[PDB]
Write a protein that binds this ligand. Structure first.
Ligand SMILES: CCN1C(=O)N(c2c(F)c(OC)cc(OC)c2F)Cc2cnc3[nH]c(CN4CCOCC4)cc3c21
Length: 306
């Protein structure tokens, strides 16, 4: 029972449950549930204002370890602090019920789904799967997505945070088209990892791992930079799947032999070189997120929004 555990109450973050008006499901995961909610008076200055938020909670079959992870993720987000380009912590409910972790809500879904819905019916992209498509994104908008994500990672890096699974599905898009990085404070599994098991959404996270993380389970900022390269490829394929036609068992040998993904049809040479630099075999030779932010900042200014 949740009453049988000692939940860490933080007065600065604590919100009464009856201030939340729970709504539609936002998605699932390992053992966590996330719902949409309306928070009444999230800010003490405006107690009569409503704010759309996302609420994460434990499922019916959650164990003691799951609770420990959810708390761990919450306290981690506290320590890392706030940034525009990450999913921020807004509050928590630790009393009179199950643990609720309140975070920012992104209404336009993850980056893969966001981009796929805005795929032009053209030659250079796969088909738009959305039955209700949205307006095509400009070239500047695409580089802008990359910059924002890189900026968020640059911040997380400065807070000694290693994401270990940076991907398009782990980036969320707000109503104002702001890119926000998700799941950056997840507890690392203490057991060895299944290279072949899919996520609840059918994704193979193996395809984002750097070679050193893949072969020796070594995770650094440099390995995140590798992942950012794969994300860059995802953006300019508008939500494409990494290494098309390549099975996981063959991905081990291919990567070691120096094989990398081809440049997407709609992608500048300069942006592809950036992917390749991120995909450098030697971790120390990959660019830092600081350098990535500086380049992408320059490229955004020079990229046409026409
Ligand atoms: C992918 C599910 N999800 C989360 O997992 N969130 C989340 C969270 F609850 C959380 O609790 C600690 C930590 C996170 O990373 C820091 C999160 F990203 C916050 C979060 C915020 N907005 C979201 N929007 C969506 C997708 N919806 C689906 C249908 O409604 C429109 C879009 C998922 C989602 C969402």
């Amino acid at each position: 029972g949740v009453s049988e555990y000692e939940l860490p109450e933080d007065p600065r973050w604590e919100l009464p449950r009856d201030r939340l008006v729970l709504g539609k499901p936002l998605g699932e995961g390992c053992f966590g549930q996330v719902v949409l909610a309306e928070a009444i008076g999230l800010d003490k200055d405006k107690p009569n204002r409503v704010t759309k938020v996302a609420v994460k909670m434990l499922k019916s079959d959650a164990t003691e370890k799951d609770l420990s992870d959810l708390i761990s993720e919450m306290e981690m987000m506290k320590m890392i602090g706030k940034h525009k380009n990450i999913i921020n912590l807004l509050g928590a409910c630790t009393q009179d019920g199950p643990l609720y972790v309140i975070v920012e809500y992104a209404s336009k879904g993850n980056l893969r789904e966001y981009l796929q819905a805005r795929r032009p019916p053209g030659l250079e992209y796969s088909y738009n799967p959305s039955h209700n498509p949205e307006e095509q994104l400009s070239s500047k908008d695409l580089v802008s997505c990359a910059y924002q994500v890189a900026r968020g990672m640059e911040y997380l890096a400065s807070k000694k945070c290693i994401h270990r699974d940076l991907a398009a599905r782990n980036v969320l898009v707000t109503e104002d088209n702001v890119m926000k990085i998700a799941d950056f404070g997840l507890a690392r599994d203490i057991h060895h990892i299944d290279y072949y098991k899919k996520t609840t959404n059918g994704r193979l996270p193996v395809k984002w791992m750097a070679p050193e993380a893949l072969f020796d389970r070594i995770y650094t900022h440099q390995s995140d930079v590798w992942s950012f390269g794969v994300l860059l490829w995802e953006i300019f394929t508008l939500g494409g799947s990494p290494y098309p036609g390549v099975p996981v068992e063959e991905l081990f040998k291919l990567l070691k032999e120096g094989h990398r993904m081809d440049k997407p049809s709609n992608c500048t040479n300069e942006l592809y070189m950036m992917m390749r630099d991120c995909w450098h075999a030697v971790p120390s030779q990959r660019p830092t997120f600081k350098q990535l932010v500086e380049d992408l900042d320059r490229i955004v200014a020079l990229t046409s929004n026409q």
